[PDB]
Amino acid sequence: MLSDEQMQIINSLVEAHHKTYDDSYSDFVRFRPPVRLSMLPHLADLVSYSIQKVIGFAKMIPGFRDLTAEDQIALLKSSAIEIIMLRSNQSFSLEDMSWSCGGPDFKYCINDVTKAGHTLEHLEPLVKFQVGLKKLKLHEEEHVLLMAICLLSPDRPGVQDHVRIEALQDRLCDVLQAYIRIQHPGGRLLYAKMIQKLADLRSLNEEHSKQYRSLSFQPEHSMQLTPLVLEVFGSEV
Amino acid sequence: HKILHRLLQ
Ligand SMILES: C=C1/C(=C\C=C2/CCC[C@]3(C)C(C4(CCCC(C)(C)O)CC4)=CC[C@@H]23)C[C@@H](O)C[C@@H]1O
Protein backbone atom coordinates (compact mmCIF):
# COMPACT_ATOMS: atom_id res chain seq x y z
CA MET A 1 0.00 0.00 0.00
CA LEU A 2 0.81 3.74 -0.19
CA SER A 3 2.25 5.89 2.59
CA ASP A 4 0.57 8.94 4.09
CA GLU A 5 3.13 11.14 2.30
CA GLN A 6 2.27 9.74 -1.14
CA MET A 7 -1.44 9.93 -0.34
CA GLN A 8 -0.99 13.61 0.53
CA ILE A 9 0.71 14.35 -2.81
CA ILE A 10 -2.31 12.76 -4.49
CA ASN A 11 -4.77 14.85 -2.47
CA SER A 12 -2.85 18.06 -3.23
CA LEU A 13 -2.68 17.29 -6.95
CA VAL A 14 -6.33 16.27 -7.31
CA GLU A 15 -7.46 19.40 -5.47
CA ALA A 16 -5.15 21.60 -7.54
CA HIS A 17 -6.67 20.26 -10.76
CA HIS A 18 -10.19 20.73 -9.39
CA LYS A 19 -9.43 24.38 -8.61
CA THR A 20 -8.02 25.14 -12.07
CA TYR A 21 -10.34 23.16 -14.35
CA ASP A 22 -13.98 24.16 -14.67
CA ASP A 23 -16.25 21.46 -16.08
CA SER A 24 -18.97 24.09 -16.62
CA TYR A 25 -16.75 25.80 -19.24
CA SER A 26 -18.80 28.90 -18.44
CA ASP A 27 -15.83 31.27 -18.77
CA PHE A 28 -15.64 30.44 -22.49
CA VAL A 29 -18.32 33.03 -23.28
CA ARG A 30 -15.67 35.68 -22.50
CA PHE A 31 -13.35 34.60 -25.32
CA ARG A 32 -13.59 36.21 -28.70
CA PRO A 33 -16.29 34.06 -30.31
CA PRO A 34 -15.59 31.18 -32.71
CA VAL A 35 -16.03 31.84 -36.43
CA ARG A 36 -16.38 28.89 -38.83
CA LEU A 37 -7.88 32.01 -39.99
CA SER A 38 -11.30 32.69 -38.47
CA MET A 39 -10.84 30.40 -35.45
CA LEU A 40 -7.50 31.93 -34.41
CA PRO A 41 -8.99 34.62 -32.09
CA HIS A 42 -11.19 32.16 -30.18
CA LEU A 43 -8.53 29.44 -29.93
CA ALA A 44 -5.83 31.95 -28.96
CA ASP A 45 -8.11 33.10 -26.15
CA LEU A 46 -8.82 29.44 -25.28
CA VAL A 47 -5.11 28.66 -25.02
CA SER A 48 -4.24 31.90 -23.23
CA TYR A 49 -6.90 31.19 -20.60
CA SER A 50 -5.61 27.62 -20.33
CA ILE A 51 -2.04 28.80 -19.77
CA GLN A 52 -3.28 30.74 -16.74
CA LYS A 53 -5.03 27.63 -15.40
CA VAL A 54 -1.83 25.59 -15.88
CA ILE A 55 0.16 28.21 -13.92
CA GLY A 56 -2.33 27.92 -11.05
CA PHE A 57 -2.01 24.12 -11.11
CA ALA A 58 1.80 24.29 -11.11
CA LYS A 59 1.90 26.67 -8.14
CA MET A 60 0.00 24.07 -6.08
CA ILE A 61 2.25 21.15 -7.02
CA PRO A 62 4.24 20.20 -3.88
CA GLY A 63 7.68 21.78 -4.17
CA PHE A 64 7.13 23.72 -7.39
CA ARG A 65 6.70 26.97 -5.45
CA ASP A 66 10.09 26.41 -3.79
CA LEU A 67 12.02 26.35 -7.06
CA THR A 68 13.66 29.60 -8.10
CA ALA A 69 11.47 31.79 -10.27
CA GLU A 70 13.88 31.13 -13.16
CA ASP A 71 13.34 27.35 -13.06
CA GLN A 72 9.57 27.80 -12.66
CA ILE A 73 9.48 29.88 -15.85
CA ALA A 74 11.66 27.46 -17.83
CA LEU A 75 9.45 24.51 -16.85
CA LEU A 76 6.20 26.27 -17.73
CA LYS A 77 7.45 27.71 -21.04
CA SER A 78 8.63 24.31 -22.23
CA SER A 79 5.74 22.24 -20.84
CA ALA A 80 2.72 24.56 -21.26
CA ILE A 81 1.47 23.25 -24.62
CA GLU A 82 1.95 19.66 -23.37
CA ILE A 83 0.01 20.21 -20.13
CA ILE A 84 -2.69 21.78 -22.26
CA MET A 85 -2.70 18.89 -24.73
CA LEU A 86 -3.00 16.53 -21.72
CA ARG A 87 -5.70 18.39 -19.81
CA SER A 88 -7.85 18.72 -22.95
CA ASN A 89 -8.34 14.90 -22.90
CA GLN A 90 -11.05 15.66 -20.29
CA SER A 91 -13.20 17.40 -22.94
CA PHE A 92 -12.21 15.20 -25.88
CA SER A 93 -14.83 12.66 -26.90
CA LEU A 94 -14.23 9.42 -28.77
CA GLU A 95 -17.73 9.62 -30.29
CA ASP A 96 -17.35 12.69 -32.50
CA MET A 97 -13.51 12.87 -32.45
CA SER A 98 -13.54 16.40 -31.09
CA TRP A 99 -13.28 18.51 -27.95
CA SER A 100 -16.72 19.25 -26.49
CA CYS A 101 -16.79 22.07 -23.93
CA GLY A 102 -20.46 22.27 -23.03
CA GLY A 103 -22.36 23.60 -26.02
CA PRO A 104 -21.93 23.20 -29.78
CA ASP A 105 -20.30 26.62 -30.25
CA PHE A 106 -17.47 25.40 -27.99
CA LYS A 107 -17.18 22.04 -29.78
CA TYR A 108 -13.94 22.05 -31.77
CA CYS A 109 -13.79 19.58 -34.63
CA ILE A 110 -10.61 19.03 -36.64
CA ASN A 111 -11.81 21.47 -39.30
CA ASP A 112 -12.18 24.18 -36.67
CA VAL A 113 -8.51 23.94 -35.73
CA THR A 114 -7.32 24.13 -39.36
CA LYS A 115 -9.02 27.58 -39.38
CA ALA A 116 -6.43 28.63 -36.78
CA GLY A 117 -3.25 27.91 -38.77
CA HIS A 118 -2.61 24.21 -38.10
CA THR A 119 -2.25 21.73 -40.93
CA LEU A 120 -3.38 18.16 -40.54
CA GLU A 121 0.33 17.28 -40.48
CA HIS A 122 0.01 18.36 -36.83
CA LEU A 123 -3.63 17.60 -36.09
CA GLU A 124 -3.34 13.93 -37.13
CA PRO A 125 -0.87 12.92 -34.37
CA LEU A 126 -2.67 15.20 -31.92
CA VAL A 127 -6.03 13.46 -32.28
CA LYS A 128 -4.36 10.04 -32.39
CA PHE A 129 -2.69 11.07 -29.14
CA GLN A 130 -6.03 12.11 -27.62
CA VAL A 131 -7.67 8.85 -28.74
CA GLY A 132 -4.92 6.65 -27.30
CA LEU A 133 -4.94 8.68 -24.09
CA LYS A 134 -8.74 8.35 -23.88
CA LYS A 135 -8.41 4.58 -24.36
CA LEU A 136 -6.09 4.39 -21.33
CA LYS A 137 -9.19 5.32 -19.26
CA LEU A 138 -7.01 6.90 -16.59
CA HIS A 139 -8.11 7.56 -13.06
CA GLU A 140 -8.24 11.21 -12.06
CA GLU A 141 -5.37 10.50 -9.65
CA GLU A 142 -3.35 9.22 -12.61
CA HIS A 143 -4.35 12.05 -14.93
CA VAL A 144 -3.19 14.71 -12.46
CA LEU A 145 -0.02 12.76 -11.58
CA LEU A 146 0.88 12.61 -15.27
CA MET A 147 0.36 16.38 -15.70
CA ALA A 148 2.56 17.05 -12.69
CA ILE A 149 5.26 14.66 -13.92
CA CYS A 150 5.16 16.34 -17.35
CA LEU A 151 5.60 19.80 -15.83
CA LEU A 152 8.33 18.63 -13.45
CA SER A 153 10.59 17.27 -16.20
CA PRO A 154 14.22 18.37 -15.68
CA ASP A 155 15.08 17.64 -19.35
CA ARG A 156 13.83 21.02 -20.50
CA PRO A 157 15.87 23.85 -22.02
CA GLY A 158 16.68 26.47 -19.43
CA VAL A 159 16.41 24.58 -16.14
CA GLN A 160 19.34 25.09 -13.79
CA ASP A 161 18.60 22.96 -10.71
CA HIS A 162 18.45 19.65 -12.53
CA VAL A 163 19.00 17.68 -9.33
CA ARG A 164 16.10 19.23 -7.42
CA ILE A 165 13.64 18.97 -10.32
CA GLU A 166 14.52 15.33 -11.07
CA ALA A 167 14.06 14.45 -7.40
CA LEU A 168 10.58 16.00 -7.44
CA GLN A 169 9.70 14.09 -10.62
CA ASP A 170 11.03 10.80 -9.22
CA ARG A 171 8.91 11.14 -6.08
CA LEU A 172 5.86 11.74 -8.31
CA CYS A 173 6.65 8.75 -10.52
CA ASP A 174 6.97 6.58 -7.40
CA VAL A 175 3.54 7.75 -6.20
CA LEU A 176 2.10 6.97 -9.61
CA GLN A 177 3.78 3.59 -9.97
CA ALA A 178 2.51 2.60 -6.53
CA TYR A 179 -0.95 4.08 -7.20
CA ILE A 180 -1.36 1.95 -10.34
CA ARG A 181 -0.12 -1.24 -8.70
CA ILE A 182 -2.28 -0.96 -5.57
CA GLN A 183 -5.38 0.94 -6.75
CA HIS A 184 -5.85 0.19 -10.47
CA PRO A 185 -6.99 -3.36 -11.46
CA GLY A 186 -5.46 -4.65 -14.67
CA GLY A 187 -2.91 -1.83 -14.81
CA ARG A 188 -0.02 -4.25 -15.28
CA LEU A 189 1.48 -2.28 -18.19
CA LEU A 190 -0.24 1.07 -17.66
CA TYR A 191 2.72 2.91 -16.12
CA ALA A 192 4.82 2.17 -19.20
CA LYS A 193 1.99 3.29 -21.50
CA MET A 194 1.90 6.66 -19.72
CA ILE A 195 5.68 7.15 -19.90
CA GLN A 196 5.32 6.63 -23.65
CA LYS A 197 2.59 9.29 -23.74
CA LEU A 198 5.14 11.73 -22.28
CA ALA A 199 7.42 11.02 -25.24
CA ASP A 200 4.54 11.57 -27.67
CA LEU A 201 3.99 14.93 -25.99
CA ARG A 202 7.55 15.90 -26.90
CA SER A 203 6.91 15.08 -30.55
CA LEU A 204 3.66 17.06 -30.46
CA ASN A 205 5.40 19.99 -28.76
CA GLU A 206 7.94 20.15 -31.57
CA GLU A 207 5.31 20.02 -34.30
CA HIS A 208 3.31 22.74 -32.55
CA SER A 209 6.41 24.94 -32.36
CA LYS A 210 6.89 24.62 -36.12
CA GLN A 211 3.27 25.58 -36.80
CA TYR A 212 3.24 28.31 -34.16
CA ARG A 213 6.51 29.78 -35.48
CA SER A 214 4.81 30.42 -38.83
CA LEU A 215 1.95 32.22 -37.07
CA SER A 216 4.24 34.23 -34.80
CA PHE A 217 6.17 35.44 -37.88
CA GLN A 218 3.21 36.90 -39.80
CA PRO A 219 2.23 40.12 -37.92
CA GLU A 220 -1.30 40.00 -39.36
CA HIS A 221 -1.61 36.64 -37.60
CA SER A 222 0.53 37.24 -34.51
CA MET A 223 -1.55 40.36 -33.74
CA GLN A 224 -4.50 38.03 -33.11
CA LEU A 225 -2.62 36.21 -30.32
CA THR A 226 -2.67 37.41 -26.72
CA PRO A 227 0.25 38.85 -24.74
CA LEU A 228 0.42 35.76 -22.45
CA VAL A 229 0.57 33.37 -25.40
CA LEU A 230 3.20 35.55 -27.09
CA GLU A 231 5.38 35.62 -23.99
CA VAL A 232 4.96 31.93 -23.01
CA PHE A 233 5.34 30.45 -26.51
CA GLY A 234 8.03 32.98 -27.40
CA SER A 235 11.78 32.46 -27.49
CA GLU A 236 13.01 35.12 -25.03
CA VAL A 237 15.35 33.86 -22.30
CA HIS B 1 8.78 37.54 -18.83
CA LYS B 2 6.76 40.22 -17.01
CA ILE B 3 3.39 38.45 -17.15
CA LEU B 4 4.69 35.00 -16.13
CA HIS B 5 6.64 36.47 -13.24
CA ARG B 6 3.58 38.40 -12.05
CA LEU B 7 1.31 35.34 -12.33
CA LEU B 8 3.86 33.17 -10.49
CA GLN B 9 3.82 35.93 -7.82
C1 LIG C 1 -7.24 24.29 -23.98
C2 LIG C 1 -8.07 23.31 -23.52
C3 LIG C 1 -9.14 22.65 -24.43
C4 LIG C 1 -8.84 22.14 -25.63
C5 LIG C 1 -7.58 22.04 -26.34
C6 LIG C 1 -7.45 21.98 -27.67
C7 LIG C 1 -8.60 22.05 -28.65
C8 LIG C 1 -8.36 22.83 -29.94
C9 LIG C 1 -6.94 22.64 -30.45
C10 LIG C 1 -5.92 22.99 -29.36
C11 LIG C 1 -6.23 24.36 -28.73
C12 LIG C 1 -4.43 22.88 -29.68
C13 LIG C 1 -3.79 23.36 -30.98
C14 LIG C 1 -4.11 24.82 -31.37
C15 LIG C 1 -3.08 25.79 -30.80
C16 LIG C 1 -3.29 27.22 -31.31
C17 LIG C 1 -2.11 28.18 -31.14
C18 LIG C 1 -1.69 28.27 -29.62
C19 LIG C 1 -2.46 29.61 -31.59
O1 LIG C 1 -1.04 27.58 -31.81
C20 LIG C 1 -2.44 22.79 -31.34
C21 LIG C 1 -3.65 22.31 -32.05
C22 LIG C 1 -3.79 22.27 -28.71
C23 LIG C 1 -4.70 21.83 -27.61
C24 LIG C 1 -6.07 21.86 -28.30
C25 LIG C 1 -10.53 22.74 -23.78
C26 LIG C 1 -10.53 22.26 -22.28
O2 LIG C 1 -10.22 20.85 -22.21
C27 LIG C 1 -9.42 23.03 -21.43
C28 LIG C 1 -8.01 22.83 -22.04
O3 LIG C 1 -6.99 23.55 -21.24
Numbering used by the authors:
A (entry chain A2): 155 to 190, 252 to 452
B (entry chain B2): 687 to 695
Task: Tell me, in the authors' exact words, what the paper reports.
The 1,25D3 plays a key role in calcium homeostasis by promoting VDR activities in the intestines, bones and kidneys, and is involved in a wide spectrum of biological pathways, including cell differentiation and immune responses.
In addition, Gemini-72 restores the transcriptional activity of VDRgem (L337H in zebrafish or L309H in humans), a point-mutated VDR unresponsive to 1,25D3. In addition, we show that BXL-62 is able to restore the transcriptional activity of the VDRgem variant, that was designed to respond selectively to gemini ligands and to be unresponsive to 1,25D3. To determine whether similar structural modifications are observed in the VDR variants, BXL-62 in complex with zVDRgem (L337H) was crystallized, solved, and refined to 2.4 Å. All of the interactions observed in the zVDR WT-BXL-62 complex were conserved in zVDRgem-BXL-62, notably the specific and tighter interactions involving the C-20 cyclopropyl moiety. The BXL-62 interacted more strongly with H337 of zVDRgem through the C-21 atom of the cyclopropyl than that of zVDR WT. The stronger interactions formed by the side chain of BXL-62 with residues of H6, H7, and of the C-terminus stabilized the active conformation of VDRgem, in contrast to the 1,25D3 that exhibited weakened hydrogen bonds between 25-OH and zHis333 and zHis423. In contrast, 1,25D3 failed to stabilize the interaction with the zVDRgem His423. This different interaction between BXL-62 and 1,25D3 with His423 is due to the His337 having a stronger contact probability with His423 in the zVDRgem-BXL-62 complex. Taken together, these results demonstrate that the addition of the cyclopropyl to the 1,25D3 skeleton is sufficient to restore the VDRgem agonist conformation and dynamics.
